[PDB]
Each structure stands twice: as structure tokens, then as C-alpha cells.
Symmetry: C3
Subunit: 319 residues, 3 copies
């Protein structure tokens, strides 16, 4: 009865593995998603000399209107009131002992301005070639050991995610609407305790991504909040819930270069254009929503059955 043994193996594969395990009787379908991230949290910096400085959702969220891939500022370097005048160059670009060593015109590489050919003093001692550009130039030589926005670990990230599968015309929201009047705005996400709460503490998000928040709070980083949908639409639609997973992107063996984009707050004072050059060492959260809806379709079901007869056929022939 070797045929029966061979046929049983084929029958197990078609039913147990393809259908029961691999869900081969359903047509997988992707989703188009819309993510609305809402942040709550205020961070004070206690900056010496200047004093405390608060930062609300309008100031530490890039873009302000929110996006799938947004940035939460955790640290920054500010150059107050930059103007396009004549000043020294940063030593990293170049140094000079006399005006004869300063080549007129913009530098070939690492250019910070129009080198006028004059050697002026960036430091009390170090003298760098005068350049036409944003003055004073961005020093960017020290990163505050305690992150200026260190409180951002307590910031709550409310993610309002709406997905839809065009093939099956099924629309789902990351809010399962099981909340009650008292439970309203009284949950924080946890991988075990509250897997369905869409409110994420940033410190918890970074921690569950394998990255220490204090390391990312200073130099910046990128965290991928993958909202994974695995709707088995053969069942009821309420049984499909998002599975939030956090990944440390650009880890580089858990030593990331740190997300350190630069943005300016342009303003005009006394009729002269100025700007506030912020080198923001923020944590960029990317809501990489992925989905695979498995709904019973007669095409994969019957092709597998036909495949099975082919699988069963070839097998018994060989034996």
C-alpha cells in the first residue's frame, strides 16, 4: 500500500499545509492606508542662561500636520538670528594663517559660503577664511549630554490608522471601538497588557524597538512603527486587529548615525531677513503600515486542488 502512503503525504500537504497552515485557499490582498498621528506632551529643556523653554506639539513635530513618516524632536542645536553677511567659516571646512591661503570663490567641497579671500578669526586663535553666508555659522561642536527634550519619552503617540482592501471593499480602523466612557483616553499601548490601545509612549516605542531612548534622545534616530494587518476576512471583520511592531531602522549594528535634519525659522527684523537654524536630532517615526487580507476566493482554492491532482499524479508515477 505504498500508493496510499504517498497519497496521504500529498493529501496532508494540500489540506494541512497549504490550506490550514499557509491559507492557500484565500486570495491575499494589500491595503491602502491613511495614518493620522496625534501627539500629546510638553517638554521643558531647562537650558542654562536662557532658562526653561517649552516645546509643544506645534514645535517638536515635523511635519506639523502629521504624516506616515514624521519626526519627533528630542534634541537640537540652535544658531540664533543667522544672517547672510560676512563672517568666519567653520574650521571643519578649512583653516588659514594668512589671506594668501584663502582661495577666492566658493570652495570645491565642504563649502559654507563665498570665500572672500580674507583670513579672519573664527576662534580667539583659530583663523578661518571669511565666507559670505549665514552668520554666525553653525558651530555644531557640542551635543547636550542630557537631551534637551528628554521628557519626550513620556510623550503619547495616538495613531489613528484607517486601512481598506480595494479587492474586498472592506474598510477597517485601528480603533476597534470597544472603548467605554470611563476607558476613554485612559490606556497606553503594551505588547501584552494593551495590544489594541493605539496610544504609544515614545519611550516605550523606542524601548520595544531594541534601542535605548537616551541614546536616541541625544543624537536622534529612526524607529519604524509597522502597523501590520492580517485580516482573515473569511471570519468576522471585528476579529481583525492591528499588530503594532517597532523596529530600529538604520541600526548599523545598534550604532545609528542619528537622524539629524536641519530646519530654519525664517524671520525679518529691522527689515533684514534672519533665520533660526535648528539642527534637530529628532526621532523619526515611520508608520510603515502593511496588510494582507485573506478572504476565501474560489480561484486559489480550486487551483490548489488542481495542483494537488498534479502533485499527487507526478508522485505516484515516480514510485
Amino acid at each position: 500500500v505504498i500508493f496510499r502512503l504517498i497519497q496521504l503525504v500529498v493529501l496532508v500537504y494540500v489540506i494541512g499545509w497549504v490550506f490550514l497552515y499557509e491559507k492557500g485557499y484565500q486570495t491575499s490582498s494589500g491595503l491602502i492606508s491613511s495614518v493620522s498621528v496625534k501627539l500629546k506632551g510638553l517638554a521643558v529643556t531647562q537650558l542654562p542662561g536662557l532658562g526653561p523653554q517649552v516645546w509643544d506639539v506645534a514645535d517638536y513635530v515635523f511635519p506639523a500636520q502629521g504624516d506616515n513618516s514624521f519626526v519627533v524632536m528630542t534634541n537640537f542645536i540652535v544658531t540664533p538670528k543667522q544672517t547672510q553677511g560676512y563672517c568666519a567659516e567653520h574650521p571643519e571646512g578649512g583653516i588659514c594663517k594668512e589671506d594668501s591661503g584663502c582661495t577666492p570663490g566658493k570652495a570645491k567641497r565642504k563649502a559654507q559660503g563665498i570665500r572672500t579671500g580674507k583670513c579672519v578669526a573664527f576662534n580667539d586663535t583659530v583663523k578661518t577664511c571669511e565666507i559670505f553666508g549665514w552668520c554666525p555659522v553653525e558651530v555644531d561642536d557640542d551635543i547636550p549630554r542630557p537631551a534637551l527634550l528628554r521628557e519626550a519619552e513620556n510623550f503619547t503617540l495616538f495613531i489613528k490608522n484607517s486601512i481598506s482592501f480595494p479587492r474586498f471593499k472592506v474598510n477597517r480602523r485601528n480603533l476597534v471601538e470597544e472603548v467605554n466612557a470611563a476607558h476613554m483616553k485612559t490606556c497606553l499601548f503594551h505588547k501584552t497588557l494593551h495590544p489594541l490601545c493605539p496610544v504609544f509612549q515614545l519611550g516605550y516605542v523606542v524601548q520595544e524597538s531594541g534601542q535605548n531612548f537616551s541614546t536616541l534622545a541625544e543624537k536622534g534616530g529612526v524607529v519604524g512603527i509597522t502597523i501590520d494587518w492580517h485580516c482573515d476576512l473569511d471570519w468576522h471583520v471585528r476579529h481583525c486587529r492591528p499588530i503594532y511592531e517597532f523596529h530600529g531602522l538604520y541600526e548599523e549594528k545598534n550604532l545609528s548615525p542619528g537622524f539629524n535634519f536641519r530646519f530654519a525659522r525664517h524671520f525679518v527684523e529691522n527689515g533684514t531677513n534672519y533665520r533660526h537654524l535648528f539642527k534637530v536630532f529628532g526621532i523619526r517615526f515611520d508608520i510603515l503600515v502593511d496588510g494582507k487580507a485573506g478572504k476565501f476566493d474560489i480561484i486559489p482554492t480550486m487551483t490548489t486542488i488542481g495542483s494537488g491532482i498534479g502533485i499527487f499524479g507526478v508522485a505516484t508515477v515516480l514510485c
Copy 2:
């Protein structure tokens, strides 16, 4: 002749259903899309006291450069010239009858600043704990019954969408280039009259999404403009046109919380940093482009035929 009857059912399924109906002889392929949204429209607000205030594409579009998921401001609450000084707190955060009820330091939850421990008067009567923060604090207690930007319903949304299917190396534009010199910039999209015109009135977009514009114009909302491509590349490439569909995202039983992001216009006056805190109740339009190109490929065609022989086989065996 029961075999012929069973075989006919299988033959109908393979040809009529899989091939003719389900297009099982073609390899479905997704697309990578690029969306360039152009808006035309000016909205006046006729704000009492201040007077009229115009809002052009530079001011009511977030982001300004445009994106797949952008926001069109339909209403806003403005806090003019916020400064990081010492003032009262919003009553929602907390209230106080005396300085002894104000806990020094930042509040555990619903924190709006650094509570100095002093109880000062937010209202003529209500007294809230003094907090270091953006002053004056955002009241956010009244929403203009007529939306400040109510004219946005007449705003035209010109969507320049370029898609491409990497598998088939076919590039398509939502502009079928059937326009003529006179027809240029003389069409508005309609689900029946002009299904191919890429210029969408925002009032029409919201209306066709099942949401009343006046409701969304005040508190904000999210509208999903799904540009659906269903190219049957077996035919000519000109026969593939976008199918624009509008969906009300986060409807919550047609009672949305309203998209109400906050952004600031930072500026410096008299050497002091200020900002204009706008709580924008805009309508966020997400251009969720989805595509499935069906081009004749020998792999799905012959696997179905092989599946068919398996389907036909198993059937006649059972009978």
C-alpha cells in the same frame, strides 16, 4: 453522459470565470505612483473686528509643496503672538482657589507648562495655576459656527498623477491628453459627466465621500481620494484611465472627531521669539493611489490550464 455535464461545469469555470471574468490569464501587478496636487482658490473669512483675511494656496495647503496626503485648511483657531512667559493655565488642565493647591513643577497629565505654584486668574472669576509656557495659552473654547474658510468648497483640486508598473515597464499619466486648446482648464470632475477630468472641486469631493462639507468645514475631516488604476495592458494603453473614488475616512458612524492639527508661525519681534499658534481644522485629502495592471502572461494562463486538468480530474473521479 454525466461526465460531459461535469466536464462542462469545469470548462465553464476555467474559461468563463477564471479567464473571462476573473482575468486569471493575466499577472496582476502593483504600481509605484507620484502625485502632484495643484490647488486654485482664495478664501476670505470676513472675521469681525480684524476684518477680511484672504488665504491662498501658500497658506491653506499643508504641506506647501504638496504630497499624497495633504491638508486643506477649512477652519482654524489663532492665538496671536504667543510667547514663552508667565501666565495662567487653561481651566481644562486644572483650577485652583489658592496658591497652596498648585503643585510646583510640570503636571503629571494634561500639562501645559511649568506650574510655578502660584494661583492666578485665567478668567475674571476662574483662577488657574500659573504655568511657564506659550502665553497667552490657547483658549480653544469656541469654533466659528460659519467656517472661516467656507469658500474652500469651490476650491479646485488639480491632481497630476503619474503611475508606472515596474513589471511591465508601462508608464501612465492621469492626463489622457485628449484636451484641446479651448478645453484647456475648462473642466471640473464629475462621477458621470467628466469622469476623466483631473480637476476636483473640494465641495464635490467631500459631497461624493458621503460627508457634508459644512460639517467638515468647521471641525475638520479626512477624505480619501483613491485614484484606482485597473489597466488591462493586453488592450491598448490608452484604454486605461484612472477611476477616482472618494471615501470618508475615520467616519466613526458618520461622526468624525475632525482633523484638528496644530501648527505655529514662529517670528521674532523686538528680539523676542513669538509664534502664531493655529489649530487648523482642515480637511486632509489622502491620494491613496492603487493599481492592478492585468497583462497577458503565460505563467497564470498555463497554470490555470494545468489546474483545470487537475480540477477536471478530481471531479470525474468523485463521480
Copy 3:
């Protein structure tokens, strides 16, 4: 031996074409990607009268924090210190010889403000209807023949792209980490010389997209940098590298309208709100990352084999 000849053709198709050529023994899977674009480059404009004007990564990148679809400003038209007062209208909107020809209220189409009904002089000769709006109005009548930011062709676009295939739990970075201490920051991308260097010169990107940079530098354009991943995860993960391809989106027979979005730099002077209306003729780079990981899966392998037996079956029956 016609059967053997027919069987050989089927056997070649199943193995040679489906498996060896079309990789029909592997389950294709898409990827969720995160793109971090870093730009280096300073552009001077040598604007007559005003003088030189520098533009760094903080000023010519939209959005500042970076995104998959970002804009690099190559040209702009600036309207300094626009205010919401009473001034003339642009002639394109309308003209007038007397106040009786100016209809009070906002214009039905091409409206630039609240027409007060008075006919004032936009030009020394041309007289247009006074409108309440941003004053002075955007002329937008001349485009600098040499692009103000023409140096942007030398700008280096460092693209830090992290992808991941959720089905196979494989994370990849566009950085293959073959760099050495000396090679660090010493490469530029080339289609042949350096196919793996993630640093792209913008002039090279536009040139390889089939578009002349000088044409796009003036009126703007859209360039699609498709980072294509084709991981054959059956092999080692190091053998999968990104394939960068540049496409000219919205070419319109290689005559693009030019990406010409508008953004404003709002500021307050003397207690009055102003803005700097920039019509940016930038080049919008869209990082359209696409991926198809082929990893050996028993489902496509055995269904093809079963399909084959069906293919082989039907064939020999016909003959």
C-alpha cells in the same frame, strides 16, 4: 515519438521558463521602505541689486525633515513683504478702464482678492481693479534665464534607504557596508562606475532621467528615483543590492509644465503680519522604492509541478 517531443516542450517550460527564467518556484513579496535623504550643497544666486544669496539644506529642501517625495529648489520668484492690504490686481485676472467696470466682491474665476470696485493702476498704463489681498501681488511675469540655484546640479543626494520584507523577516539597507575608512564619503553614484554608491549628484540624476538639468533648473520638474530591490533571498542576503533608476515623471513628450509650487515665510514686522511669497520652481525627487523578494517557497514550487502535470496532460490529450 511525438509524445516525447510534446513532453519535452512542457518539461522545458516548467523548468527552464517558469523556474529558471521566471523564478516560479519562489513567492514574490513586496517591501515596506523607509527613506532618509541627506543633501549636501550650497547654491549662490548672485542676484543683481540685492547681491549674492546663499541657500543651504535648510532652505532649498521641502520638506526640511526629508521625505520619500521631497523638493529641491532650483529656481524661485520672491515677492518681498506681502501684506493683506489694498492694492491693484494682476492683469491676468482682469483689466479695467474705469471703476464702473470693476464688479464688487470676489471674482467668479481667477480671483486674487476682494474687488473693491475701484480701478487703480497696476502698471504706469495698465489699470486693474483694486483687490483686498496679499500686497504687492505676485507678478510672476519673468523667470530668470540662468536659474537662480543653478549650482544644485552639483548637490549630492545621499539616500539612506532601509527596506524590509514582512513575509520573510529580512531587513536590508541600501548601504552594503563595504566602505572603508578612506572610502568614507568619497564616492558619487554612477550607473556603471559606482552602481552601489548611495550619493547622487542632482545634475547626474536629472541627466540620467532623460531630462536636461538646465531646462528643469529654471521652470522646475519632477524626477523619479526608483530604488528597485530584487532580492533573491534563496541566495545570501548580501547579494541583494538596490538598483537605482531615474525616470522623468510628467514628461509630456519631454516638455514638462515644471514643478512650481508656492510657499510663504510668514513674519510680523511692526505688529503687522507679512509673508515672503516664494513661487519655487524646484525639482521634486520622488524616491519610489519598489521591491520583489524571491525566496524559495514550497507552495509556488509544488503548484507549478502540479500545474505541469496538468499542462503535460492536456497537451498529450490533444495530440
